[PDB]
Write an enzyme that holds these catalytic residues in place. Structure first.
Site, PDB file in Angstrom:
ATOM      1  CD1 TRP D  20     -53.280 -45.416 169.319  1.00 43.51           C
ATOM      2  CD2 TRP D  20     -54.958 -46.118 170.632  1.00 43.51           C
ATOM      3  NE1 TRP D  20     -53.280 -44.627 170.458  1.00 43.51           N
ATOM      4  CE2 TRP D  20     -54.298 -45.034 171.280  1.00 43.51           C
ATOM      5  CE3 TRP D  20     -56.060 -46.710 171.266  1.00 43.51           C
ATOM      6  CZ2 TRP D  20     -54.691 -44.543 172.531  1.00 43.51           C
ATOM      7  CZ3 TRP D  20     -56.459 -46.206 172.518  1.00 43.51           C
ATOM      8  CH2 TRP D  20     -55.773 -45.134 173.129  1.00 43.51           C
ATOM      9  CB  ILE D  53     -48.265 -40.297 166.678  1.00 46.75           C
ATOM     10  CG1 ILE D  53     -49.479 -39.714 165.971  1.00 46.75           C
ATOM     11  CG2 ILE D  53     -47.357 -39.118 167.036  1.00 46.75           C
ATOM     12  CD1 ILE D  53     -49.120 -38.782 164.849  1.00 46.75           C
ATOM     13  CD  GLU D  54     -47.324 -42.747 169.887  1.00 53.65           C
ATOM     14  OE1 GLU D  54     -48.355 -43.441 169.806  1.00 53.65           O
ATOM     15  OE2 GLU D  54     -47.366 -41.531 169.715  1.00 53.65           O
ATOM     16  CB  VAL D  74     -54.912 -49.588 162.295  1.00 54.03           C
ATOM     17  CG1 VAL D  74     -56.049 -49.500 161.304  1.00 54.03           C
ATOM     18  CG2 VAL D  74     -54.469 -51.022 162.438  1.00 54.03           C
ATOM     19  CB  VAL D  75     -54.473 -44.004 161.028  1.00 53.15           C
ATOM     20  CG1 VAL D  75     -55.041 -42.758 161.677  1.00 53.15           C
ATOM     21  CG2 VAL D  75     -53.022 -44.100 161.447  1.00 53.15           C
ATOM     22  CB  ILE D  76     -59.988 -46.083 161.619  1.00 54.12           C
ATOM     23  CG1 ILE D  76     -59.381 -47.479 161.388  1.00 54.12           C
ATOM     24  CG2 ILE D  76     -61.420 -45.986 161.079  1.00 54.12           C
ATOM     25  CD1 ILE D  76     -59.936 -48.604 162.205  1.00 54.12           C
ATOM     26  CG  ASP D  79     -66.266 -37.777 165.480  1.00 53.23           C
ATOM     27  OD1 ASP D  79     -66.627 -38.755 164.793  1.00 53.23           O
ATOM     28  OD2 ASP D  79     -66.690 -37.552 166.604  1.00 53.23           O
ATOM     29  CG  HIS D  82     -55.953 -36.626 165.174  1.00 51.36           C
ATOM     30  ND1 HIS D  82     -54.919 -36.046 165.868  1.00 51.36           N
ATOM     31  CD2 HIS D  82     -55.835 -37.966 165.391  1.00 51.36           C
ATOM     32  CE1 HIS D  82     -54.167 -36.985 166.418  1.00 51.36           C
ATOM     33  NE2 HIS D  82     -54.704 -38.162 166.154  1.00 51.36           N
ATOM     34  CG  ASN D 107     -46.672 -47.560 154.595  1.00 53.16           C
ATOM     35  OD1 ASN D 107     -47.653 -48.102 155.106  1.00 53.16           O
ATOM     36  ND2 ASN D 107     -46.587 -46.224 154.431  1.00 53.16           N
TER      37      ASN D 107
END
Ligand code: NA
Ligand code: NA
Ligand code: NA
Ligand code: NA
Ligand code: NA
Lengths: 148, 149, 146, 152, 148
Positions: D20, D53-54, D74-76, D79, D82, D107
């Site tokens: 992602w 998450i995986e 990457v986590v951005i 809204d 989550h 990490n």
């Protein structure tokens, strides 16, 4: 809910007596309505004491309901207590492969807690919801296990 | 009236802000004495961070443990991560050891808040007493539950 | 503190050397003042690396001191690192029944971290505090278990 | 300043990168790979997953049979809440694995408020930082340190 | 381009906020079917809190589990502790059982936000499909890593 076989544990704290008793009353109503007139019921002082007794019951019960109330006070105490207790309830369910219905209120005000305690005037009955969650899940698990 | 004369009680108290810690410890001892336990195992540690490993050490050989101490917010986020880790350590231990851990670790924003909770003559609340009553009442309950099997 | 009989491990990160070196030096001085002249000293790059090394040291020492610094940047990274590291140190202390003195600073600014690193101008010496923490608690456990 | 690199030729390295926000994920992987090669490891085990998450479950699989694992992704923030719960649980998870397996987990999971912050940390030509490189350095240096300690 | 025909898939979906829960499940089903799995194990529970114990039950006898449900913020801090603890539970299970758990548990501030992520006709996203894709593709990756 047809729950007649099942052994149900209920752990209810006592801090803010009136709220806790009403949570207990609602849990008991749903259990009775589901075929269980005599769940194992235990009381503890505060929410902090709930996990260790929920653990004791989960090891010998098909389902446990965790009941109590934490209302935010002046300090950060509230945040660490609510996080730790809620996460402890999650751990025990997993460790013991037994559902723990969570009817522990975590509110900013007393009126919020009263509004969720299943009193005559309350918007919601969290005691009842926790009991339904514990029982319905235990039945599902008993159905899954009785296969193959 | 709690009657706990049969039970082994550990008490661990931190020493950082000694006026407060000593009062928390005094409030716990009193409840214990009033409950029939004149001689609990009392152990001191430096700060709140040190409490959990000693609470574990005590929980293994005692029926109930009381954890007492005070963390007061300073300038940095250190407060938040210490309070959360210590609090979850206390929860982990009680579960791992199936032993009640009374939480009398004050986690306050100000010193006046901590003093007001330390069971000093002027205090609103006596957190050491509440943490000892919690731990002892819970141990008698666990005892009762286990005598039914 | 007489800690002569105790085996002591120290793990210090190396990211931000002014801070990390000063924390290590404050911990060393306590250890020396307590009769431990030769503690096992291990360096890592950052705070995230401290837990796995602390775990390794804890398994063969009576006390361990964890040292480093996480300073808040632009993103939430700070929150998740500090929380995860801090909780890791608690986990290890419990798993190994060995104290882990927490000298991992978690500050909003670099000036806050300098002021806690025990340089001559610092208000506090967190390396010193972490070492006294680990060593006094180790003596306490030794006593309890005797 | 020129400083000799890590010699990690004797080590088995695993790398797990999510997908992602793929141009960012790919850039982290490339930075990590560069550092591994420079350090003497031209053939790391490289595995791709969907999202962050995986990452844990695969990092665990790799950690059982490698001396070091690099976790990339990457986590951005979007809204909803989550982001917060995902980031916390994933970071916790990487911490748990390193301890469970006594194996370092580097990490390089970015957790940012904006895309621009992630891009600036992904080792792109225009990026301020190369967090893939950083994460590979951490895992490998730590692994050599552990081997050194275990010889004692 | 997901061929999981030979894989055992479990799906747990809460019930609270039916429309959204049902759409999340239809989204995951569709993905599984398209991936060669026409008879997944599908279990229903009441709410988010109940998801982990069932997800654990399935993960022990499946190659992949999909967790589906919705938590929408209400009045009190309840939301924050339920969300943190469920999400953390799903992470724990995946690691305990070395089996991927796809996360399709929505955690939103508003109902509209949930509806927009539920894979309804007009939804911006299909989080059930995304969670099923996640669990299955990771399951295949592990199978390859284990193969020799
Ligand atoms: Na049970
Ligand atoms: Na005990
Ligand atoms: Na040790
Ligand atoms: Na390994
Ligand atoms: Na499995």
């Amino acid at each position: 809910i047809d729950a007649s076989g099942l052994r149900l544990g209920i752990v209810a704290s006592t801090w803010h007596s009136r709220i806790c008793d009403a949570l207990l009353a609602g849990a008991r109503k749903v259990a009775a309505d589901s075929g269980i007139d005599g769940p194992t019921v235990v009381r503890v002082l505060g929410a902090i004491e709930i996990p260790v007794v929920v653990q004791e019951l989960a090891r010998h019960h098909d389902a446990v309901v965790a009941l109590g109330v934490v209302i935010r006070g002046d300090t950060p105490h509230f945040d660490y207590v609510c996080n730790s207790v809620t996460q402890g309830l999650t751990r025990i369910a997993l460790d013991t492969s037994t559902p723990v219905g969570n009817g522990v209120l975590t509110t900013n005000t007393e009126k919020q807690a009263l509004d969720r305690a299943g009193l005559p005037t309350s918007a919601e009955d969290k005691g009842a919801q926790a009991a339904a969650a514990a029982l319905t899940t235990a039945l599902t698990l008993l159905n899954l296990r009785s296969r193959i």
